[PDB]
Short mmCIF file of all heavy atoms in Angstrom, two decimals:
data_model
loop_
_atom_site.label_atom_id
_atom_site.label_comp_id
_atom_site.label_asym_id
_atom_site.label_seq_id
_atom_site.Cartn_x
_atom_site.Cartn_y
_atom_site.Cartn_z
N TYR A 1 8.90 -2.17 -1.48
CA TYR A 1 8.00 -2.62 -0.41
C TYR A 1 6.59 -2.09 -0.64
O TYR A 1 5.62 -2.61 -0.04
CB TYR A 1 8.53 -2.22 0.97
CG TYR A 1 9.79 -3.01 1.30
CD1 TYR A 1 11.01 -2.37 1.51
CD2 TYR A 1 9.77 -4.41 1.26
CE1 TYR A 1 12.18 -3.12 1.67
CE2 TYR A 1 10.92 -5.16 1.40
CZ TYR A 1 12.13 -4.50 1.60
OH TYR A 1 13.29 -5.23 1.69
N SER A 2 6.45 -1.09 -1.50
CA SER A 2 5.15 -0.56 -1.83
C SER A 2 4.36 -1.70 -2.44
O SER A 2 3.14 -1.72 -2.39
CB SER A 2 5.24 0.60 -2.82
OG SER A 2 5.57 1.80 -2.13
N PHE A 3 5.07 -2.67 -3.02
CA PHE A 3 4.37 -3.82 -3.56
C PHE A 3 4.37 -4.97 -2.56
O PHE A 3 3.32 -5.53 -2.26
CB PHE A 3 4.96 -4.33 -4.87
CG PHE A 3 4.29 -5.58 -5.35
CD1 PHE A 3 3.01 -5.52 -5.92
CD2 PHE A 3 4.84 -6.83 -5.12
CE1 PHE A 3 2.30 -6.68 -6.25
CE2 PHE A 3 4.15 -8.01 -5.43
CZ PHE A 3 2.87 -7.93 -6.00
N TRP A 4 5.55 -5.34 -2.06
CA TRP A 4 5.64 -6.47 -1.12
C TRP A 4 4.65 -6.32 0.05
O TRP A 4 3.85 -7.21 0.31
CB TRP A 4 7.05 -6.61 -0.56
CG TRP A 4 8.12 -6.93 -1.56
CD1 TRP A 4 9.27 -6.23 -1.77
CD2 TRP A 4 8.17 -8.05 -2.45
NE1 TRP A 4 10.04 -6.83 -2.73
CE2 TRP A 4 9.39 -7.96 -3.16
CE3 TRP A 4 7.32 -9.13 -2.71
CZ2 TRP A 4 9.77 -8.91 -4.12
CZ3 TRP A 4 7.69 -10.07 -3.67
CH2 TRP A 4 8.91 -9.94 -4.37
N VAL A 5 4.73 -5.20 0.73
CA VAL A 5 3.84 -4.97 1.87
C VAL A 5 2.45 -4.54 1.40
O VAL A 5 1.45 -5.05 1.90
CB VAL A 5 4.42 -3.90 2.78
CG1 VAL A 5 3.48 -3.66 3.95
CG2 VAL A 5 5.78 -4.36 3.29
N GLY A 6 2.41 -3.63 0.43
CA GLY A 6 1.14 -3.16 -0.09
C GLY A 6 0.28 -4.29 -0.61
O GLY A 6 -0.92 -4.35 -0.34
N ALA A 7 0.89 -5.21 -1.34
CA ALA A 7 0.16 -6.35 -1.88
C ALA A 7 -0.35 -7.25 -0.76
O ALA A 7 -1.42 -7.86 -0.87
CB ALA A 7 1.04 -7.13 -2.85
N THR A 8 0.44 -7.35 0.32
CA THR A 8 0.05 -8.19 1.45
C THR A 8 -1.20 -7.55 2.07
O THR A 8 -2.17 -8.25 2.36
CB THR A 8 1.18 -8.26 2.52
OG1 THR A 8 2.32 -8.91 1.95
CG2 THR A 8 0.72 -9.05 3.74
N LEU A 9 -1.15 -6.24 2.27
CA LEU A 9 -2.28 -5.52 2.82
C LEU A 9 -3.52 -5.69 1.94
O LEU A 9 -4.63 -5.87 2.44
CB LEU A 9 -1.94 -4.04 2.99
CG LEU A 9 -0.88 -3.79 4.05
CD1 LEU A 9 -0.32 -2.39 3.95
CD2 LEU A 9 -1.50 -4.02 5.42
N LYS A 10 -3.32 -5.69 0.62
CA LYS A 10 -4.42 -5.87 -0.31
C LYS A 10 -5.04 -7.26 -0.13
O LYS A 10 -6.24 -7.40 -0.10
CB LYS A 10 -3.93 -5.73 -1.76
CG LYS A 10 -4.96 -6.12 -2.81
CD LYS A 10 -6.05 -5.06 -2.97
CE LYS A 10 -5.47 -3.77 -3.53
NZ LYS A 10 -6.52 -2.79 -3.94
N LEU A 11 -4.19 -8.27 0.01
CA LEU A 11 -4.68 -9.63 0.21
C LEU A 11 -5.41 -9.76 1.55
O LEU A 11 -6.31 -10.59 1.70
CB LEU A 11 -3.51 -10.61 0.16
CG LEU A 11 -2.84 -10.79 -1.19
CD1 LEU A 11 -1.60 -11.66 -1.04
CD2 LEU A 11 -3.83 -11.43 -2.16
N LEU A 12 -5.03 -8.94 2.53
CA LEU A 12 -5.66 -8.98 3.84
C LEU A 12 -6.82 -7.99 3.87
O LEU A 12 -7.41 -7.74 4.95
CB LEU A 12 -4.63 -8.64 4.93
CG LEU A 12 -3.47 -9.65 5.08
CD1 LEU A 12 -2.44 -9.12 6.05
CD2 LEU A 12 -4.02 -10.99 5.54
N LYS A 13 -7.16 -7.43 2.72
CA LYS A 13 -8.27 -6.50 2.58
C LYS A 13 -8.23 -5.21 3.38
O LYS A 13 -9.27 -4.67 3.72
CB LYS A 13 -9.59 -7.19 2.88
CG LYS A 13 -10.28 -7.79 1.70
CD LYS A 13 -9.97 -9.25 1.48
CE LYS A 13 -10.75 -9.79 0.30
NZ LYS A 13 -10.57 -11.25 0.07
N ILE A 14 -7.05 -4.69 3.70
CA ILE A 14 -6.99 -3.44 4.44
C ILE A 14 -6.05 -2.44 3.80
O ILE A 14 -5.67 -1.45 4.44
CB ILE A 14 -6.57 -3.63 5.91
CG1 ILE A 14 -5.16 -4.20 6.01
CG2 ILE A 14 -7.56 -4.53 6.62
CD1 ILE A 14 -4.50 -3.97 7.34
N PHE A 15 -5.66 -2.67 2.55
CA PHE A 15 -4.77 -1.74 1.86
C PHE A 15 -5.51 -0.42 1.71
O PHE A 15 -4.92 0.66 1.73
CB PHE A 15 -4.35 -2.27 0.49
CG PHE A 15 -3.43 -1.33 -0.25
CD1 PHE A 15 -2.16 -1.03 0.26
CD2 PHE A 15 -3.83 -0.72 -1.42
CE1 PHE A 15 -1.32 -0.14 -0.39
CE2 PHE A 15 -3.00 0.18 -2.09
CZ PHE A 15 -1.74 0.47 -1.57
N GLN A 16 -6.82 -0.53 1.57
CA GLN A 16 -7.71 0.62 1.41
C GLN A 16 -7.61 1.61 2.57
O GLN A 16 -8.00 2.76 2.43
CB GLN A 16 -9.15 0.13 1.31
CG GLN A 16 -9.59 -0.63 2.54
CD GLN A 16 -10.99 -1.18 2.43
OE1 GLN A 16 -11.94 -0.43 2.20
NE2 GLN A 16 -11.13 -2.49 2.59
N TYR A 17 -7.10 1.16 3.71
CA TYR A 17 -6.99 2.02 4.88
C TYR A 17 -5.62 2.66 5.05
O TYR A 17 -5.37 3.34 6.04
CB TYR A 17 -7.35 1.24 6.14
CG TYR A 17 -8.75 0.66 6.11
CD1 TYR A 17 -8.98 -0.70 6.29
CD2 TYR A 17 -9.86 1.49 5.87
CE1 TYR A 17 -10.27 -1.24 6.23
CE2 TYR A 17 -11.15 0.97 5.82
CZ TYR A 17 -11.34 -0.40 6.00
OH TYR A 17 -12.61 -0.93 5.97
N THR A 18 -4.75 2.46 4.07
CA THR A 18 -3.41 3.05 4.13
C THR A 18 -3.46 4.44 3.54
O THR A 18 -4.48 4.83 2.98
CB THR A 18 -2.37 2.20 3.32
OG1 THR A 18 -2.72 2.21 1.94
CG2 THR A 18 -2.37 0.77 3.81
N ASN A 19 -2.39 5.20 3.67
CA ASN A 19 -2.34 6.55 3.12
C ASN A 19 -1.80 6.48 1.68
O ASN A 19 -0.59 6.26 1.48
CB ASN A 19 -1.45 7.43 3.99
CG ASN A 19 -1.29 8.83 3.43
OD1 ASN A 19 -0.93 9.01 2.26
ND2 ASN A 19 -1.54 9.83 4.25
N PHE A 20 -2.66 6.66 0.69
CA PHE A 20 -2.27 6.59 -0.71
C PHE A 20 -1.32 7.69 -1.18
O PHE A 20 -0.33 7.42 -1.86
CB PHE A 20 -3.50 6.61 -1.62
CG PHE A 20 -4.23 5.30 -1.69
CD1 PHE A 20 -4.06 4.33 -0.73
CD2 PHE A 20 -5.12 5.06 -2.75
CE1 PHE A 20 -4.75 3.11 -0.80
CE2 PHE A 20 -5.82 3.86 -2.83
CZ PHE A 20 -5.63 2.88 -1.85
N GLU A 21 -1.65 8.93 -0.83
CA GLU A 21 -0.85 10.05 -1.28
C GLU A 21 0.61 10.00 -0.90
O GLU A 21 1.49 10.19 -1.76
CB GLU A 21 -1.49 11.36 -0.77
CG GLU A 21 -2.96 11.53 -1.22
CD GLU A 21 -3.14 11.49 -2.75
OE1 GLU A 21 -3.00 12.56 -3.38
OE2 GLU A 21 -3.42 10.40 -3.31
N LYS A 22 0.91 9.75 0.37
CA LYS A 22 2.30 9.68 0.81
C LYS A 22 3.05 8.53 0.14
O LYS A 22 4.22 8.66 -0.19
CB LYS A 22 2.37 9.56 2.32
CG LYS A 22 2.01 10.83 3.08
CD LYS A 22 2.12 10.62 4.58
CE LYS A 22 1.82 11.90 5.35
NZ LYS A 22 2.78 12.99 5.02
N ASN A 23 2.35 7.42 -0.05
CA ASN A 23 2.97 6.26 -0.70
C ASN A 23 3.28 6.63 -2.16
O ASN A 23 4.40 6.44 -2.60
CB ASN A 23 2.01 5.07 -0.63
CG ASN A 23 2.59 3.81 -1.27
OD1 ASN A 23 3.82 3.64 -1.31
ND2 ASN A 23 1.73 2.93 -1.73
N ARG A 24 2.29 7.16 -2.87
CA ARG A 24 2.45 7.56 -4.26
C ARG A 24 3.57 8.58 -4.40
O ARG A 24 4.39 8.49 -5.30
CB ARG A 24 1.15 8.14 -4.82
CG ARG A 24 1.23 8.58 -6.29
CD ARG A 24 -0.15 8.92 -6.86
NE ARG A 24 -0.11 9.09 -8.32
CZ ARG A 24 0.33 10.19 -8.94
NH1 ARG A 24 0.75 11.24 -8.23
NH2 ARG A 24 0.40 10.22 -10.25
N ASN A 25 3.57 9.58 -3.54
CA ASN A 25 4.61 10.59 -3.62
C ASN A 25 6.00 10.02 -3.44
O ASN A 25 6.94 10.42 -4.13
CB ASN A 25 4.33 11.73 -2.63
CG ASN A 25 3.08 12.49 -3.01
OD1 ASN A 25 2.59 12.41 -4.14
ND2 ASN A 25 2.53 13.25 -2.06
N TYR A 26 6.14 9.06 -2.52
CA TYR A 26 7.45 8.48 -2.30
C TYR A 26 7.90 7.70 -3.53
O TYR A 26 9.03 7.89 -4.00
CB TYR A 26 7.47 7.54 -1.09
CG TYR A 26 8.83 6.88 -0.96
CD1 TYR A 26 9.91 7.59 -0.43
CD2 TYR A 26 9.08 5.63 -1.54
CE1 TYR A 26 11.22 7.06 -0.49
CE2 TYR A 26 10.37 5.10 -1.60
CZ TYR A 26 11.43 5.83 -1.09
OH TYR A 26 12.71 5.31 -1.22
N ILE A 27 7.04 6.84 -4.04
CA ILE A 27 7.37 6.03 -5.21
C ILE A 27 7.84 6.91 -6.37
O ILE A 27 8.90 6.67 -6.96
CB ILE A 27 6.18 5.21 -5.71
CG1 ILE A 27 5.74 4.24 -4.60
CG2 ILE A 27 6.56 4.45 -6.97
CD1 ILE A 27 4.45 3.48 -4.94
#
């Protein structure tokens, strides 16, 4: 989902407002 949802957020131009560290650490 880091891609499915993350990519959706990127297309909606707000992925930049998500928390990168926690996402990266989980992956």
Side-chain angles (χ1 to χ4, degrees):
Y1 291 118
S2 279
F3 176 74
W4 297 125
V5 179
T8 296
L9 292 166
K10 171 75 66 170
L11 291 173
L12 296 172
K13 268 95 178 184
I14 63 160
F15 180 63
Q16 60 183 303
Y17 301 124
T18 64
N19 176 308
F20 283 19
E21 303 303 273
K22 287 180 178 299
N23 181 28
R24 181 170 190 281
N25 294 342
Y26 177 77
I27 299 174

